[PDB]
Enzyme design. Structure first.
Site, PDB file in Angstrom:
ATOM      1  N   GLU A  35       0.960  -1.243   0.126  1.00 10.68           N
ATOM      2  CA  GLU A  35       0.001  -0.113   0.128  1.00 10.68           C
ATOM      3  C   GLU A  35       0.807   1.317  -0.158  1.00 10.68           C
ATOM      4  OE1 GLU A  35      -2.832   0.162  -0.724  1.00 10.68           O
ATOM      5  OE2 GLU A  35      -3.866  -1.934   0.086  1.00 10.68           O
ATOM      6  N   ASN A  46      -7.644   8.158  -5.904  1.00 11.99           N
ATOM      7  CA  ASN A  46      -8.240   6.983  -6.595  1.00 11.99           C
ATOM      8  C   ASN A  46      -8.966   7.553  -7.901  1.00 11.99           C
ATOM      9  OD1 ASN A  46      -9.092   6.313  -3.155  1.00 11.99           O
ATOM     10  ND2 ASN A  46      -7.370   5.385  -4.417  1.00 11.99           N
ATOM     11  N   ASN A  59      -8.805   5.067   2.885  1.00  9.29           N
ATOM     12  CA  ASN A  59      -9.863   5.967   1.759  1.00  9.29           C
ATOM     13  C   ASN A  59     -10.500   6.935   2.570  1.00  9.29           C
ATOM     14  OD1 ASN A  59     -12.782   5.609   1.323  1.00  9.29           O
ATOM     15  ND2 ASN A  59     -12.240   3.495   1.088  1.00  9.29           N
ATOM     16  N   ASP A 101     -15.404  -4.933   8.548  1.00  7.57           N
ATOM     17  CA  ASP A 101     -16.803  -4.058   7.849  1.00  7.57           C
ATOM     18  C   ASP A 101     -17.474  -5.274   7.155  1.00  7.57           C
ATOM     19  OD1 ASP A 101     -18.428  -1.810   7.339  1.00  7.57           O
ATOM     20  OD2 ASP A 101     -17.676  -2.057   5.162  1.00  7.57           O
TER      21      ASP A 101
HETATM   22 NA    NA Z   1      -6.682   2.000  -2.360  1.00  8.13          NA
END
Ligand code: NA
Ligand SMILES: [Cl-]
Ligand SMILES: [Cl-]
Ligand SMILES: [Cl-]
Ligand SMILES: [Cl-]
Ligand code: NA
Ligand code: NA
EC number: 3.2.1.17
Length: 129
Positions: A35, A46, A59, A101
């Site tokens: 990442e 993005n 994000n 999540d």
């Molecule tokens: Na990403």
């Protein structure tokens, strides 16, 4: 801050990521490598206009507020800039919400594509943990 590999492993472990949601430490180190290259200051735009922030490229579409991602949420209740700090506490706290999540670490596409199913223990080799 650009963390060393074992340095990041130790910090993530101290912050309770080892085996969090069943994901071993090497999974988290591997994700961070692909990442951010272990760089807390990493930011990347993005295609949807959101931005990813920090060591785990969290994000702004769902997780933090950057003030420029229309229609997005801030589920970690944090400015995205707080995810760029030398101290990884905020990134870790937020990552714990993300990985809870429903889809586990598949939330990080690079984890799915580059870490998932691999020898992730190699990422903590040699570390005094
Ligand atoms: Na990403
Ligand atoms: Cl490395
Ligand atoms: Cl591991
Ligand atoms: Cl926004
Ligand atoms: Cl899972
Ligand atoms: Na947001
Ligand atoms: Na930093």
């Amino acid at each position: 801050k650009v963390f060393g590999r074992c340095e990041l492993a130790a910090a993530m472990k101290r912050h309770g990521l080892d085996n969090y949601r069943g994901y071993s430490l090497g999974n988290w180190v591997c994700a961070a490598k692909f990442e951010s290259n272990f760089n807390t200051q990493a930011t990347n735009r993005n295609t949807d206009g959101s931005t990813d922030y920090g060591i785990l490229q969290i994000n702004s579409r769902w997780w933090c507020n950057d003030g420029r991602t229309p229609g997005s949420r801030n589920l970690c209740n944090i400015p995205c800039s707080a995810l760029l700090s030398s101290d990884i506490t905020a990134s870790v706290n937020c990552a714990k919400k993300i990985v809870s999540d429903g889809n586990g670490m598949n939330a990080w596409v690079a984890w799915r594509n580059r870490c998932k199913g691999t020898d992730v223990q190699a990422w903590i080799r040699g570390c005094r943990l």
